[PDB]
Symmetry: C3
Subunit: 157 residues, 3 copies
């Protein structure tokens, strides 16, 4: 048996950069108002994998309430989310991540994101796709007011 999951995340710009996307530090004018590192790509991926497990969302495992993972970075959370998902007997099929930002340009840093995620998930990189796209200057991303990320995932049994 196999399982579909889906992740969505948005953070607005604010403060001073740089920014944290897919574990990778990316140089940029502004930063991201967030309850943690605000790694939008990792959050969505995390929500997507938990969704395939039906373990709800990251908000559910890691409330601002629990003191246990309070102040953890996105890479930490993804590792713990994953271990819990694995506890349910699941393993990785594959994952696809879609970054939506007018700027900065992601491509230089994408190869590094995919390496970062594959370690955190202990899979081949063949199982990790990341990509970036614009909304051609339309919407809140277009006006450069924020970054958005979707992600999909397939878990196995």
């Amino acid at each position: 048996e196999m399982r579909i999951g889906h992740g969505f995340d948005v953070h607005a710009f604010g403060g001073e950069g740089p920014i944290i996307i897919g574990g990778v530090r990316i140089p940029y004018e502004k930063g991201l108002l967030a309850h943690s590192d605000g790694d939008v790509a990792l959050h969505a991926l995390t929500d997507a994998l938990l969704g395939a497990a039906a373990l709800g969302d990251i908000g559910k495992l890691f409330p601002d309430t629990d003191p246990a993972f309070k102040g953890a970075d996105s890479r930490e959370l993804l590792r713990e989310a994953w271990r819990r998902i694995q506890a349910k007997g699941y393993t990785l099929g594959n994952v696809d991540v879609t970054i939506i930002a007018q700027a900065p340009k992601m491509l230089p840093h994408i190869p590094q994101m995919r390496v970062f995620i594959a370690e955190d998930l202990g899979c081949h990189m063949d199982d990790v796709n990341v990509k970036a796209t614009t909304t051609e200057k339309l919407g809140f991303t277009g006006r450069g007011e924020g970054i958005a990320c979707e992600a999909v995932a397939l878990l196995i049994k």
Copy 2:
């Protein structure tokens, strides 16, 4: 094999509360404008299941011609879409639903939404993920102009 489907729906706030999400009446300042009951979560789920089965979308199972379902609430539609989907010999894999609203708060109502979808698709609650997230005041969701919802689904032959 298994079949993927995707669903996306939006409604604007307008008129008087309450709003109906995943079959659950959620008190709110305004309500959702729709020819239907405005249940974006179920409309999106229904389209994902229909899409997985290659059956079009709601507009194609329920055209302004067919009087049978004029004014029928979103759960009745979901079950008929399910009937027609089953009739092709598909069973449910799992589903994942992401409600995108700045407000109201969805968390206490999600367990019930998950309950109703389970019934309506005759499955374990284990097969059904519902999550909620915001766009941090950005876009039309952020400014409180409406609610969106994304859904993915996996069918089995």
Copy 3:
């Protein structure tokens, strides 16, 4: 066993039409602005196919850098991507494509899109599903500033 992919595309209105969506020339008041033919439906799908394959995206296979695919249309890019995907030993499971447009009406032209896609992907039409929906006047789509599209794909190993 199987592999999920996801693709998202957006183009803006400018210039004369018609627009080309899913390979289909649809008459409309304005056209889409793009380096390409503007086909967000074939692009988003292409990206979903390449994401399933961990083959990257369109920006990676056919960059703006390389003037070799100057004048290439979305279907040509689609069949090329698919060739490369098949060469890595993948077949098609199914695809689901969701057009997000306030206007024009996509219904008359949808069945044809499916034909073009299935022939391009060398599959049965029952493996292709395409639907259309509005944002109910909300957002950049809602105000008629552009057309978004979102696609999911499932490949077979």
